[PDB]
């Protein structure tokens, strides 16, 4: 509208410090939801191994669990190197 | 209550891996790919059994695979490895990223001789 | 129990008696109320840290925030008492006897 | 709880921190995890009146891990006896232990 | 060997503070079109010695104890602030070095309270209470600003700020924070235009050393640690010189105005930028490592 | 002139330079000419405590390599 | 030990430099110099400023673990609770601001 | 720039953590042999010191369960030099 | 207060209590008490006078002492059980500390001295919250820890409270003093039956709140705070004197009024456990409460005290106070005895 | 002797408590609480609580006790009293130190004392843990869990602090 651009133009003239603060805080709240890279933050936190990776007893029907750390099976960090 | 069972000193003996922590750090990546099988059996034992006594044999094979690993290096790649872990040992944090050249020389050495 | 507990429990008791045995300054009693909190902070932190109860590690912090928030309220009352009488003496707060 | 809202709504407000055998950050265990795990599993569902007699053994073991009173008593006896023989020169610590 | 190290830290600090007084008087003089000390020793280099001797032989309270505690607390805590500083290696390597400095800096407000209390003058006391209110008010923005910076660093370790700025100074991503930090240090050290002696001037150097580390990180080469020290020293010296520069060029604030400068400008903006810097690493996928 | 202010700055610059220079040189003098080992976490302390035992002289900054293997 | 040694030196050196500074002057033996309720009064504004500092300082302690909190896999909850704490830190200030708690006119 | 550098630092930490994971089995095995050896050593001097005490059983547990319990610092270093106990107890906390 | 702020402060008083009632964690119980105390201090000061400040300070010191003992009992319990669940405590010293902390928070004798003074020092509306809503949170904790409470301690406190409350009220002419001592005496009944049947502790809590709210609501309608000012009521609102008589007779436990119901059910629960002496002593001692209630009815409803000339000017104006739920409250306070079996809804 | 640093630190903890509990002028009262607070942080540090110990300095000492001394200076006598110059203040100090010294004597001599609870005087180190080589601080991970696990704790703690501000402005307005 135009009743609002005159409001914003008034605070920008009388209280520039607060207009900046309310602009930065809105960006902080909003941008994380709209960013396509927020998913990589969860993955990178999930990819960091703090504990020992305890192996699974190989009963005989665990096809996708690798037998060796260098085997093709299991999750990979290929996206992390390119990212 | 019963008597806490303890294996005697004779059973606890084994040849140690008497190399410093920076030597282990420098070989750690190759070490984890060469000695994975005995290493993972020991750790499966420990988590399953929850008892250091019930996994004393498996822990001796960890040393045996580790000692053999360090002889493979001492027979073919001693100098590139000595030059590499001496760079790691200098840093207070033992950082990998400070010794990428010496790490490289060590990698072609093992990828050709082993 | 361990030996250090003897003194942390001794300190809570000391500040409890100090709290219940007033003198004149109302400020001197609020400090006894904060010595009690300090002892309970240390007692809790030793228990939680020694037992490795990880998620309880934040209990001492919460206990420290709320008790300080309480002390802020207590000091405010002391200041309002000081306004009415010019001193924080506890013997001036005896109107409600009748 | 007086009003068991959490179970009705299926929302966890504070149960995550009530015991130390629960899920911890980075799967960090507490020092008495196995002892508390047993006592809870022994005592579960039977009521506290029953659990005061049918889980007594587990609860003693958990209380021994928690405060380690009996372990310290056994250690003081050995320390007391050992130093006595050192006082009378009957015993000498080995190469190690010295 | 450690005792030498602690001595090799304290004594240079006292000498540096002694000759900071000289630099202050000459730098202010030349900005005022005069010279400053150039008679006591060549180029005035003996002026600090003359002042010191004269001060300690000059002829010299409500609470005798507090009149002794106040100088010790300020002097003891001013020196303690230097023990974790990576220059490039700290004297005491702490995992919570940043947190340690906020804690010790907070205790500095006690000497102000005790010295005012021990004076015995009602007038002296209220002057101390005004100084205590200024300090704690501006400790709020120091803590929040510092927290916003540490979200790009990843820990409380002071040597990790060296690694954080391996490619680029934090002043570029955080210049709005560096601005409010720099003013807050002046207010925290009660320097002009917020002035409404050994320990005082030791803090001034230490806060500017801490500023160089926080915002103007110097590259460290482990094989040549001395280069970091030289570059590090130059950055802190110029930051300290800018305190002198600022003092010469401005009038003083009123007391209510500097309270308003924080409670109504820095804090509202410092809060928003804290929100911004919590969100930014998450949305950009640039969260720093925890170790 | 302004450059007559430099000598005072030179004395400050040297003074603030010594603490860092002394610490770095003392650390290497006390650690066989290497950086002082940093142990912020138990894992680093554990490796530092193992280095002390392995060294054979009770000093964690003496390193042992393949010359101890056989 | 190192930290305790450093603190002991710092506060021992301060103590020495303080006592001798109290005693070196009496070397001169200067001539004797003949120089023969409970509220200041205090203003409620200088009390509120201290209390507002305390309450904001408490809410800062809640934020200090933020650098470590960003390392969790539950980042959506962490971010929501972090922005919640800072916003209520702003809400408190806005209440102070609009009720003249931040004034100095009497 | 901060984003690019911080990503690179996360990758280095993953490599740093992975070197530890490769070495944890070997350190875990030696830790087990040191704990049991220390416990076995303590049991011997317990037998000698407490031989003459009537009613004593050597190596008796204080627990009803026959499960393995991690010993506390008192059980391991309960008969050793104060220098070794001090380093094992407070060494990490007092370092730097 | 600004009305919006007043509402928020009241909802924080309620929020703190609810946090205690829904929490399964001891820290959240402590937090609820801390939050609750924080928000109630404002409404006690809201008229700003030396008496309101003295009441708020005496309240703050008493409640703060109780919370530190509660936290101390919570930490001792953690040391001996390694858990935080709100349930029976696992150490007798923890139980003594918690029981005394809750006794102090309730104002039970001998931790009673603050109740008459703090209540007299605040407004009637604030006093209503102090003597009614404030009992819920401590009571709901006693409800859950009772299997570990020391019987001699809980019964010792209860008997002391029934004596102190009964005797203290005999010497009072201030309505807020009378209500405070009535509150102390009634707390003694709720904790006497707690070791035997916690349900009858809730029954007596509910009915005591309903009758206490009715009294305060009726005192607030005419702004009467002394015995003699209440004795003018017959000459302004004659209806109010009848309701005051009925409620006071109900609080006395006289059949067939609702206040007889809790005392009836507690005597039944105590004799089932072969407690004959204690309920007999308790019931007789409660006659003290009936006496200084009966005194109030004499000067209010059963006689006509002298009036004043200026009372004629009041006849021309109507009551404008809200008197919320007063018609419902007075009918629950007097006519509920026939529905006594409905107490099972609290099981 | 350093092996009982935690016990020695806790003895000074109690002496500082006897300090302000005997209740001298509220200015030495605040000095004793500062010394105990600092000594109390030392105990927490030696148990692995680096962050908890530093939160004591930053918040308790540099926040709460600063406001105490500030408030004390604005409304309390202004003139202190020579510590122990008053009979009651001195009588309680000696009484406390006598019981503090008697507890210390019987626990160290007998390696055990019994007051309400049973206390064992073998040392504090004997209960320390003998197993950890994780590459993180457990304290920090526990505290950092507040934002993930403790959504409910943060909400109520945040509300109480906001309400504290609102409450404290009402209390002091005077109308
Ligand atoms: C979802 C909705 C949640 C509902 C609760 C909302 C809480 C905010 C209260 C709103 C309000 O009072 O209006 C603002 C309003 C603000 O106006 P103001 O100008 O700023 O105040 C002027 C004075 O400063 C102040 O006014 P005053 O000095 O002239 O006198 C005030 C007096 C005015 O006169 C009265 O209100 C007396 C009648 C209320 C007492 C009876 C309550 C019911 C007793 C339980 C039995 C019910 C079955 O009201 C009060 O005393 C306030 C507290 C009364 C509650 C006493 C707690 C009794 C224990 C109940 C336990 C059982 C709960 C579960 C059931 O204050 C009022 O006086 C309202 C009167 C008219 C509307 C009444 C609506 C509320 C009635 C009480 C509801 C009871 C629920 C439990 C409350 C617990 C509180 C701790
Ligand atoms: C489903 C939930 C089940 C419970 C249903 C409760 C619905 C009734 C709500 C009545 C109500 O709004 O509260 C009266 C509420 C409180 O006013 P008050 O001063 O305490 O007394 C009522 C006025 O005299 C009333 O004077 P008024 O001329 O202003 O009358 C206006 C009022 C109509 O006035 C009324 O009818 C209020 C009287 C209804 C009874 C009071 C509620 C009792 C709740 C049941 C209690 C049962 C006790 C347990 C049963 C015994 C044990 C088995 O109109 C409305 O409330 C509109 C209905 C919106 C809902 O007043 C108003 O409604 C607006 C003013
Ligand atoms: C006012 C004067 C204040 C003087 C300083 C007080 C002590 C501060 C210690 C501190 O917080 O150090 C953080 C530092 C922070 O270290 P850190 O937590 O980063 O790392 C510890 C070491 N690692 C990482 C290997 C685990 O504390 C330590 O270094 C750990 C403790 C070391 C041993 C010291 C224990 C006693 C501490 C001093 C007790 C003082 C008692 C009070 C004196 C009277 C009141 C002032
Ligand atoms: C101003 C208008 C507010 C805009 C924000 C609305 C919230 C949108 C939302 O739902 O957040 C989700 C967001 C997207 O991530 P997503 O993986 O989809 O999470 C959902 C998992 N089922 O998840 C995120 O990225 C984080 C969301 C942060 C939102 C912060 C909002 C402030 C919280 C404090 C409230 C104060 C009271
Ligand atoms: C100009 C750039 C510069 O400072 O030179 C860099 C040089 C070594 O590079 P370095 O900064 O250590 O590493 C960069 C990545 N870490 O470092 C050096 O050249 C040595 C330092 C000389 C340059 C001084 C630093 C720039 C000036 C900042 C001083 C503070 C001025 C404050 C003014 C504000 C107040 C008005
Ligand atoms: C917007 C999100 C999307 C972003 C995209 C970009 C768009 C930007 C648009 C932003 C528009 C915001 C407009 C807000 C203007 C501020 C309101 C105002 O006019 O306040 C004026 C008033 C002045 O006060 P004063 O100077 O003392 O009195 C007058 C003397 N002549 O002061 C007052 O009335 C008192 C108010 C004080 C409280 C304001 C500051 C909040 C507290 C600090 C936290 C700052 C961060 C914000 C937190 C909110 C949640 C995010
Ligand atoms: C339900 C099952 C259980 C059964 C138990 C019995 C329950 C009954 C009590 C429940 C509550 C109901 C209260 C009844 C109120 C009666 C009010 C009334 O009848 O009028 C009072 C009268 C009116 O006064 P006025 O304002 O002048 O109106 C005149 C009209 N133009 O005002 C006057 O004129 C002044 C009266 C003088 C004072 C007389 C005192 C005696 C009153 C006796 C009635 C109260 C008895 C309560 C005890 C129960 C009895 C068993
Ligand atoms: C075991 C528990 C461990 C804690 C106890 C060890 C002492 C710890 C310090 C606590 C000291 C509290 C006593 C100080 C006090 O508050 O005294 C108040 C009061 C005297 O107050 P005042 O106004 O100064 O003089 C009036 C005399 N007509 O009281 C007096 O009459 C003065 C009495 C001073 C002697 C105090 C004796 C120790 C306190 C009793 C401990 C019992 C437990
Ligand atoms: C004005 C606003 C007042 C404050 C309320 C707004 C706060 C908004 C921010 C919090 C929203 C919840 C964020 C969330 O998603 O947390 C989910 C959390 C569990 O986390 P999750 O990752 O989903 O894993 C499952 C484990 N249960 O699951 C949870 O623990 C969430 C449960 C939180 C309870 C919310 C209800 C709060 C109502 C009382 C508020 C008290 C303070 C204000 C009171 C007003 C006055 C009375």
Of D57, D68, D77, which is closest to H64 when you measure between CB atoms? D57
β partners of residue I25: I85
The verdict on a CB contact (< 8 Å) between C52 and D30 is yes
Experimental method reported for this structure: cryo-EM
Which pair of tokens denotes residue B79?
A: 């100098």
Span from the CA of E275 to the centroid of ligand 4 (angstroms)? 14
Chains near F with 3+ CB pairs less than 8 A apart are B, E, H, J
CB E91 within 8 A of CB E5: yes
**Three-class DSSP labels, chain I:** CCHHHHHHHHHHHHHHHHHHHHCCEHHHHHHHHHHHHHHHHHHHHCCCCHHHHHHHHHHHHHHHHHHHHHHHHHHHHHHHHCECECCCCCCHHHHHHHHHHHHHHHCCCCCCCHHHHHHHCCCHHHHHHHHCHHHHHHHHHHHHHHHHCCHHHHHHHHHHHHHHHHHHHHCCCEHHHHHHHHHHHHHHHHHHCCCCCHHHHHHHHHHHHHHHHHHHHHHHHHCCCEHHHHCCHHHCCHHHHHHHHHHHHHHCCCCCCCCHHHHHHHHHHHHHCCCCHHHHHHHHHCHHHHHHHHHHHHHHHHCCCCCCCCHHHHCCCCCCCCCCCHHHHHHHCCCCHHHHHHHHHHC
User: Long-range contacts: I178-181, Cβ < 8 Å, 24+?
Assistant: I178/I292, I178/I296, I179/I119, I179/I127, I179/I131, I179/I212, I179/I215, I179/I216, I180/I107, I180/I115, I180/I116, I180/I118, I180/I119, I180/I120, I180/I127, I180/I131, I181/I115, I181/I116
Nearest alpha-carbon partner for E264 in G102, J131, D20, I47: G102
Q: What are phi and psi of G74, to 5 degrees?
A: -90, 65
Nearest-by-CA chain D residue for J149: D16
Distances (CA, A) of H2 to A70, A77, E151: 32, 21, 11
SS3 C82: helix
**Number of separate helices (H) and strands (E) present in chain D:** 5, 0
CB I258 within 8 A of CB I335: yes
Nearest alpha-carbon partner for I4 in J170, C73, G100: J170
In the 8-state DSSP scheme, what is residue J64?
I
User: Long-range contacts: B52-55, Cβ < 8 Å, 24+?
Assistant: B52/H32, B52/H35, B52/H36, B52/H68, B53/B5, B53/B6, B53/B7, B53/H36, B53/H68, B55/H32
**J123 in the Ramachandran plot: left (φ > 0), alpha (ψ -120 to 50) or beta?**
left
Q: Which residues of E77-114 are buried (b: 16+ CB within 10 A; e: fewer)?
A: bbbbbbbbbbbbbbbbbbbbbbbbbbbbbbbbbbbbbb
What domains can be seen in chain C, in order of their start residue?
3-85 (1.10.287.3510)
The verdict on a CB contact (< 8 Å) between E290 and H6 is no
Distance CA C3, CA J127 (A): 10
Nearest alpha-carbon partner for H67 in B1, B45, B42, D43: B1
Instruction: Calculate how close chain G gets to J149, using CA atoms only, in Å.
Output: 9
Distances (CA, A) of G77 to E153, G70, G96, J146, J147: 22, 10, 29, 10, 7
| Binding-site residues, ligand 5, Cβ < 6 A | E 165-166, 216-219, 231, 234-235, 238-239, 242
How, if at all, do strands J112-115 and J117-120 pair?
antiparallel
Q: Which residues of G touch A35 (CB under 8 A)?
A: none
CB E291 within 8 A of CB H16: yes
- The single residue listed with the structure tokens 């600022």 is E246
Distance CA F4, CA F9 (A): 10
> Dihedral through CA B62, CA B66, CA B68, CA B71, nearest 10?
-170
In the 8-state DSSP scheme, what is residue G26?
G
Span from the CA of I209 to the centroid of ligand 2 (angstroms)? 20
Instruction: Calculate how close chain C gets to D65, using CA atoms only, in Å.
Output: 9
Distance CA B43, CA B48 (A): 8
Nearest-by-CA chain C residue for I57: C77
Q: Would the CB of I321 count as within 6 Å of ligand 2?
A: no
Q: Does C5 contact chain D (CB < 8 Å)?
A: no
Distance CA D81, CA D75 (A): 10
Q: Which residues of H touch B41 (CB under 8 A)?
A: none
Straight-line distance from the first to the last Cα atom of chain I, in angstroms, rounded to the nearest whole number: 41
Of J157, J163, J175, which is closest to I12 when you measure between CB atoms? J163
Q: Which residues of A touch D29 (CB under 8 A)?
A: none
β partners of residue I226: I174
Nearest alpha-carbon partner for H10 in E145, J51, E215, A42: A42
Distance CA E28, CA E32 (A): 6
Q: Does G40 contact chain A (CB < 8 Å)?
A: no
β partners of residue H60: B3
CB E194 within 8 A of CB E187: yes
- The single residue listed with the structure tokens 């507690």 is I266
Instruction: Calculate how close chain G gets to E31, using CA atoms only, in Å.
Output: 34
The number of C-alpha atoms within 13 Å of B92 and in the hemisphere containing its C-beta is 23
Residues 6+ apart with CB under 8 A from A4: none
The verdict on a CB contact (< 8 Å) between A47 and H13 is no
Distance CA F15, CA I226 (A): 79
Nearest alpha-carbon partner for E141 in E97, E182, E80: E182
Which pair of tokens denotes residue C2?
A: 């361990």
Distance CA I99, CA I114 (A): 18
In the 8-state DSSP scheme, what is residue J57?
I
Rounded to whole angstroms, the maximal C-alpha distance in chain F is 72
Residues 6+ apart with CB under 8 A from G76: none
Specify the DSSP element, H or E, that contains J161: helix J151-171
Specify the DSSP element, H or E, that contains G34: none
SS3 B27: helix
Straight-line distance from the first to the last Cα atom of chain B, in angstroms, rounded to the nearest whole number: 54
Of I53, I58, I64, which is closest to C70 when you measure between CB atoms? I64
Q: Does H2 contact chain G (CB < 8 Å)?
A: no
β partners of residue E15: none
- The single residue listed with the structure tokens 């936190």 is A45
E4: burial class by Cβ within 10 Å (0-12, 13-18, 19+)? exposed
Rounded to whole angstroms, the maximal C-alpha distance in chain J is 62
Instruction: Calculate how close chain H gets to E84, using CA atoms only, in Å.
Output: 10
The number of C-alpha atoms within 13 Å of C83 and in the hemisphere containing its C-beta is 18
Dump the DSSP string for F5-47. Answer: GHHHHHHHHHHHHHHHHHHHHHHHHTTTTSPPPP--SHHHHHH
Distance CA C30, CA C10 (A): 19
Q: Would the CB of I125 count as within 6 Å of ligand 1?
A: yes
The verdict on a CB contact (< 8 Å) between B96 and H15 is yes
Distance CA A74, CA I318 (A): 82
Distances (CA, A) of I47 to I51, I115, I123: 10, 19, 8
Ligand closest to I327 (CA) is 2
Residues 6+ apart with CB under 8 A from I163: I109, I285
CB F47 within 8 A of CB E102: no
Distance CA I229, CA I237 (A): 13
Distance CA E288, CA B67 (A): 37
Ligand closest to J116 (CA) is 8
CB C15 within 8 A of CB C2: no
Evaluate the omega torsion of the peptide bond into residue I256 and state whether it is cis, within 30 degrees of 0. Answer: yes
The verdict on a CB contact (< 8 Å) between G5 and E58 is no
Distance CA E139, CA E158 (A): 19
The verdict on a CB contact (< 8 Å) between D20 and C56 is yes
Span from the CA of D13 to the centroid of ligand 9 (angstroms)? 9
The verdict on a CB contact (< 8 Å) between J166 and G95 is yes
CB E290 within 8 A of CB G68: yes
What domains can be seen in chain J, in order of their start residue?
4-169 (1.20.120.1200)
Dump the DSSP string for chain E. Answer: -HHHHHHHHHHHHHHHHHHHHHHHHHHHHHHTTS----SSSGGGTTHHHHHHHHHHHS-----HHHHHHHHHHHHHHHHHTTTT--SSS-SS--TTHHHHHHHHHHHHHHHHHHHHHHH--HHHHHHHHHHHHHHHHHHHHHHHHHHHHHHHH-SS-SHHHHHHTSSS-THHHHHHHHHHHHHHHHHHTT-TTS---HHHHHHHHHHHHHHHHHHSPPP--TT-HHHHHHHHHHHHHHHHHHHHHHHHH--PPPHHHHHHHIIIIIHHHHHHHHHHHHHHHHHHT-PPP--
Of B74, B82, B90, which is closest to F35 when you measure between CB atoms? B90
CB G66 within 8 A of CB A36: no
Q: Which residues of E159-197 are buried (b: 16+ CB within 10 A; e: fewer)?
A: bbbbbbbeeebbbebbebbbebbbbbbbbbbbbbbbebe
Query: CA angle at residue I219 from I216 to I222, to 5 degrees?
Result: 145
Q: What does R_g of chain I's alpha carbons equal in angstroms? A: 20
Distance CA H18, CA E283 (A): 26
The verdict on a CB contact (< 8 Å) between H96 and G1 is no
Specify the DSSP element, H or E, that contains J72: helix J66-74
Span from the CA of J129 to the centroid of ligand 9 (angstroms)? 36
The verdict on a CB contact (< 8 Å) between J159 and I5 is no
Which pair of tokens denotes residue B104?
A: 């490289």
Span from the CA of C19 to the centroid of ligand 8 (angstroms)? 10
Dump the DSSP string for A8-33. Answer: HHHHHHH-HHHHHHHHHHHHHHHHHH
Nearest alpha-carbon partner for I175 in I240, I233, I226, I211: I226
List residues of chain E with CB under 8 Å from any CB of chain A.
Answer: 264-265, 268-269, 271-273, 275-276, 278-285, 287, 289-290
Q: Which residues of H touch J2 (CB under 8 A)?
A: 86, 90
The verdict on a CB contact (< 8 Å) between H74 and D75 is yes
Specify the DSSP element, H or E, that contains C30: helix C26-51
Q: Does B74 contact chain F (CB < 8 Å)?
A: yes
Distance CA E191, CA E183 (A): 10
Which pair of tokens denotes residue J142?
A: 């526990």
Distances (CA, A) of H15 to H8, H12, H27: 11, 5, 18
Straight-line distance from the first to the last Cα atom of chain E, in angstroms, rounded to the nearest whole number: 29
β partners of residue I83: D19
- The single residue listed with the structure tokens 């100098």 is B79
SS3 B19: coil
I305: burial class by Cβ within 10 Å (0-12, 13-18, 19+)? middle
CATH topology classification for G7-98: Methane Monooxygenase Hydroxylase; Chain G, domain 1 (1.20.58)
Span from the CA of J9 to the centroid of ligand 3 (angstroms)? 12
Which pair of tokens denotes residue B103?
A: 């790490």
Q: Give the atom of ligand 2 at the shortest distance from the alpha carbon of I325.
A: 20
CB G46 within 8 A of CB E133: yes
Dump the DSSP string for J95-148. Answer: HHHHHHHHHHHHHHHHSEEEESEEEE-S-SGGGSB-----SS-HHHHHHHHHHH
Distance CA G104, CA A73 (A): 69
SS3 J42: helix
Q: Where are the domains of chain G?
A: 7-98
In the 8-state DSSP scheme, what is residue A55?
P
Which pair of tokens denotes residue J15?
A: 């002496």
In the 8-state DSSP scheme, what is residue C9?
H
Distance CA E67, CA H10 (A): 52
Nearest alpha-carbon partner for I293 in I230, I209, I202, I205: I230
Using CA positions, which residue lies closest to atom 11 of ligand 4? A33
Span from the CA of A22 to the centroid of ligand 6 (angstroms)? 6
Distance CA E63, CA B96 (A): 58
**E41 in the Ramachandran plot: left (φ > 0), alpha (ψ -120 to 50) or beta?**
left
The resolution in Å comes to 2.8
Q: Count of CB atoms within 10 A of residue G39's CB?
A: 16
SS3 H72: strand
Q: How many domains does chain F have?
A: 1
Span from the CA of I22 to the centroid of ligand 1 (angstroms)? 22
- The single residue listed with the structure tokens 């931790």 is I111
Using CA positions, which residue lies closest to atom 24 of ligand 3? F40
In the 8-state DSSP scheme, what is residue D15?
G
Distance CA C65, CA I41 (A): 19
- Tell me if there are at least 3 CB pairs under 8 Å linking chains J and H: yes
Write out the residue range of the structural domain in which residue F35 sits.
1-70
- Tell me if there are at least 3 CB pairs under 8 Å linking chains B and F: yes
């Amino acid at each position: 509208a135009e009743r609002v651009a005159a409001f914003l133009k008034n605070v920008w003239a009388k209280e520039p410090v607060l207009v900046a603060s309310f602009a930065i805080a809105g960006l902080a709240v909003i941008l994380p939801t709209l960013s396509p890279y927020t998913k990589y933050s969860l993955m990178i936190n999930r990819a960091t191994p703090y504990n020992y990776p305890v192996p699974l007893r190989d009963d005989g029907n665990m096809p996708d669990v690798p037998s060796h750390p260098q085997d093709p099976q299991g999750p990979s960090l290929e996206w992390l190197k390119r990212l | 209550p019963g008597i806490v069972e303890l294996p005697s000193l004779e059973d606890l003996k084994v040849q140690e891996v008497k190399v410093s922590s920076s030597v282990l750090k420098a070989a750690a990546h190759h070490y984890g790919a060469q000695c994975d099988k005995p290493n993972k059996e020991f750790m499966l034992c420990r988590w399953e059994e929850k008892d250091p006594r019930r996994c004393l044999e498996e822990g001796k094979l960890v040393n045996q695979c580790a000692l053999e690993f360090f002889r493979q290096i001492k027979r073919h790649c001693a100098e590139p490895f000595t030059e590499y872990w001496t760079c790691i040992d200098y840093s207070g944090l033992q950082l990998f990223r400070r010794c990428r050249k010496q790490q490289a020389q060590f990698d072609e050495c093992v990828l050709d001789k082993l | 129990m361990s030996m250090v507990y003897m003194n942390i429990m001794m300190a809570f008791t000391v500040s409890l008696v100090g709290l219940l045995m007033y003198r004149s300054h109302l400020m001197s009693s609020l400090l006894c109320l904060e010595g009690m909190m300090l002892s309970l902070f240390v007692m809790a932190a030793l228990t939680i840290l020694n037992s490795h109860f990880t998620l309880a590690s934040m209990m001492p912090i919460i206990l420290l925030v709320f008790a300080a928030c309480e002390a802020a309220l207590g000091l405010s009352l002391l200041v309002m008492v000081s306004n009415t009488y010019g001193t924080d003496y506890v013997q001036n707060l005896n109107l409600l006897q009748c | 709880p007086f009003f068991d809202v959490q179970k009705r709504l299926g929302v966890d407000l504070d149960r995550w921190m009530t015991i130390q055998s629960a899920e911890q950050p980075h799967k960090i265990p507490s020092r008495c995890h196995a002892f508390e795990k047993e006592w809870i599993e022994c005592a579960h569902g039977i009521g506290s009146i029953r659990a005061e007699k049918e889980c007594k053994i587990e609860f003693e073991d958990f209380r021994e891990c928690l405060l380690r009173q009996k372990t310290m008593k056994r250690l003081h006896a050995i320390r007391r006896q050992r130093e006595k023989l050192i006082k009378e020169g009957k015993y000498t610590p080995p190469p190690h232990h010295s | 060997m450690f005792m030498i190290n602690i001595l090799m830290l304290i004594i240079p600090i006292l000498l540096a503070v002694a000759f900071l007084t000289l630099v202050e008087r000459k730098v202010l003089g030349y900005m005022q079109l005069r010279k400053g000390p150039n008679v006591v020793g060549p180029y005035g280099l003996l002026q600090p010695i003359a002042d010191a001797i004269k001060l300690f032989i000059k002829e010299p309270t409500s609470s005798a104890s507090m009149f002794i505690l106040a100088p010790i607390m300020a002097l003891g805590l001013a020196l303690t602030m230097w023990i974790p500083l990576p220059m490039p290696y700290p004297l005491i390597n702490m995992n919570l070095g940043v947190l340690f400095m906020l804690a010790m800096s907070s205790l500095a407000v006690y000497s102000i309270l005790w010295s005012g209390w021990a004076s015995n003058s009602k007038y002296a006391l209220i002057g101390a209470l005004r100084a205590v209110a200024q300090t704690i008010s501006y400790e709020v923005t120091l803590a929040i600003i510092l927290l916003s910076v540490l979200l790009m660093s990843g820990s409380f370790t002071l040597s990790t700020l060296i690694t954080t700025q391996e490619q680029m100074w934090l002043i570029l991503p955080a210049w709005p924070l560096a601005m409010m930090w720099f003013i807050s240090t002046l207010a925290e050290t009660n320097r002009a235009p917020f002035d409404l002696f050994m320990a005082e001037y030791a803090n001034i150097i230490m806060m500017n050393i801490f500023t160089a580390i926080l915002f103007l990180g110097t590259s460290h080469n482990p094989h040549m640690p001395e280069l970091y020290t030289i570059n590090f020293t130059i950055k802190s010296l110029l930051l300290t010189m800018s305190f002198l520069w600022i003092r010469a060029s401005y009038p003083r604030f009123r007391y209510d105005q500097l309270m308003h400068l924080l409670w109504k400008n820095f804090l509202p903006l410092t809060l928003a930028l804290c929100m911004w810097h919590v969100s930014l690493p998450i949305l950009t996928s640039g969260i720093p490592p925890q170790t | 002139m302004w450059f007559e202010v430099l000598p005072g700055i030179a004395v400050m610059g040297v003074c603030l330079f010594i603490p860092g220079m002394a610490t770095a040189r003392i650390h290497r003098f006390s650690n066989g000419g290497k950086e002082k080992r940093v142990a912020h976490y138990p894992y680093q302390w554990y490796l530092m405590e193992r280095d002390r035992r392995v060294s054979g002289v009770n000093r964690s900054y003496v390193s042992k390599g393949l010359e101890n293997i056989d | 030990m190192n930290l305790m040694l450093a603190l002991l030196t710092n506060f021992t050196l301060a103590t020495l430099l303080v006592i001798i500074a109290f005693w070196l002057p009496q070397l001169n033996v200067y001539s004797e110099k003949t120089s023969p309720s409970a509220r200041l009064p205090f203003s409620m504004k200088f009390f509120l400023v201290a209390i507002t500092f305390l309450l904001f300082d408490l809410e800062i302690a809640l934020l200090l673990p933020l650098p470590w909190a960003s390392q969790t896999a539950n980042l959506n909850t962490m971010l929501t609770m972090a922005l919640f704490l800072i916003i209520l830190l702003a809400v408190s200030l806005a209440y102070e601001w609009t009720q003249k708690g931040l004034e100095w006119t009497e | 720039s901060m984003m690019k550098w911080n990503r690179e630092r996360r990758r280095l930490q993953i490599e740093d953590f992975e070197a530890r994971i490769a070495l944890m089995p070997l350190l875990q095995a030696e830790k087990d042999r040191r704990v049991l050896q220390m416990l076995r050593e303590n049991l011997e001097e317990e037998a000698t010191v407490m031989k003459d005490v009537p009613g004593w059983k050597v190596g008796e547990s204080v627990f009803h369960t026959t499960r393995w319990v991690t010993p506390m610092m008192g059980e391991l270093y309960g008969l050793r030099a104060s220098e070794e106990v001090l380093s094992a107890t407070y060494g990490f906390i007092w370092y730097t | 207060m600004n009305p919006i702020i007043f509402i928020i402060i009241l909802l924080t008083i309620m929020l703190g209590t609810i946090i205690v009632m829904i929490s399964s964690h001891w820290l959240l119980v402590w937090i609820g008490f801390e939050m609750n105390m924080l928000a109630i201090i404002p409404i006690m000061m809201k008229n700003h006078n030396p008496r309101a400040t003295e009441a708020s300070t005496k309240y703050f010191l008493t409640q703060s002492t109780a919370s530190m003992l509660l936290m101390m009992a919570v930490i001792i319990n953690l040391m001996f059980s390694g858990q935080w669940t709100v349930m029976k405590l696992f150490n007798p010293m923890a139980s003594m500390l918690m029981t005394m902390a809750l006794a102090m928070k309730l104002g039970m004798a001998p931790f009673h001295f603050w109740v008459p003074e703090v209540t007299q020092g605040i407004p009637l509306s604030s006093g209503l919250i102090l003597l009614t809503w404030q009992k819920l949170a401590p009571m709901s904790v006693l409800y859950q820890i009772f299997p570990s409470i020391n019987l001699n301690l809980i019964l010792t406190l209860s008997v002391l409270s029934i004596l102190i409350g009964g005797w203290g009220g005999l010497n009072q002419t201030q309505l807020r003093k009378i209500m405070a001592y009535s509150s102390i005496a009634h707390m003694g009944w709720m904790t006497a039956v707690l070791p035997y049947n916690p349900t009858m502790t809730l029954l007596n809590l509910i009915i005591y709140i309903i009758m206490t709210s009715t009294m305060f609501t009726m005192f607030m309608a005419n702004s009467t705070t002394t015995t003699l000012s209440l004795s003018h009521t017959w000459n302004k609102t004659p209806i109010m004197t009848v309701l005051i008589l009925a409620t006071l007779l109900s609080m006395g436990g006289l059949p067939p009024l609702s206040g007889f119901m809790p005392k009836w059910m507690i005597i039944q629960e105590m004799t089932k456990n072969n407690s004959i002496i204690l309920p007999t002593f308790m019931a007789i001692t409660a006659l003290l409460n009936l006496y200084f209630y009966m005194r109030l009815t004499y000067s209010t409803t059963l006689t006509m005290f002298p009036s004043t000339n200026n009372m004629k000017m009041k006849w021309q104006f109507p009551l404008m106070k809200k008197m919320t739920f007063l018609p419902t409250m007075v009918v629950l306070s007097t006519m509920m005895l026939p529905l006594t079996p409905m107490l099972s809804v609290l099981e | 002797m350093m092996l009982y640093i935690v016990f020695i630190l806790s003895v000074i903890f109690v002496m500082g408590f006897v300090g302000f509990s005997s209740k001298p002028s509220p200015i030495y009262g605040g000095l004793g609480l500062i010394v105990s607070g600092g000594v109390g942080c030392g105990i927490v540090l030696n148990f692995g609580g680096s962050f908890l110990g530093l939160m004591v300095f930053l918040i308790y000492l540099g926040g709460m006790m600063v406001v105490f001394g500030y408030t004390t200076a604005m409304a309390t006598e202004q003139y202190p009293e020579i510590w122990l110059s008053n009979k009651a203040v001195l009588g309680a100090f000696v009484t406390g130190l006598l019981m503090e010294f008697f507890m210390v004597y019987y626990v160290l001599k007998d390696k055990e004392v019994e007051v309400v609870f049973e206390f064992n005087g073998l040392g504090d180190w004997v209960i320390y843990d003998t197993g950890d080589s994780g590459f993180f601080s457990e304290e920090a991970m526990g505290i950092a869990a507040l934002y993930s696990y403790g959504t409910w704790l943060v909400i109520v703690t945040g509300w109480s602090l906001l309400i504290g501000v609102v409450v404290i402005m009402e209390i002091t307005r005077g109308n």
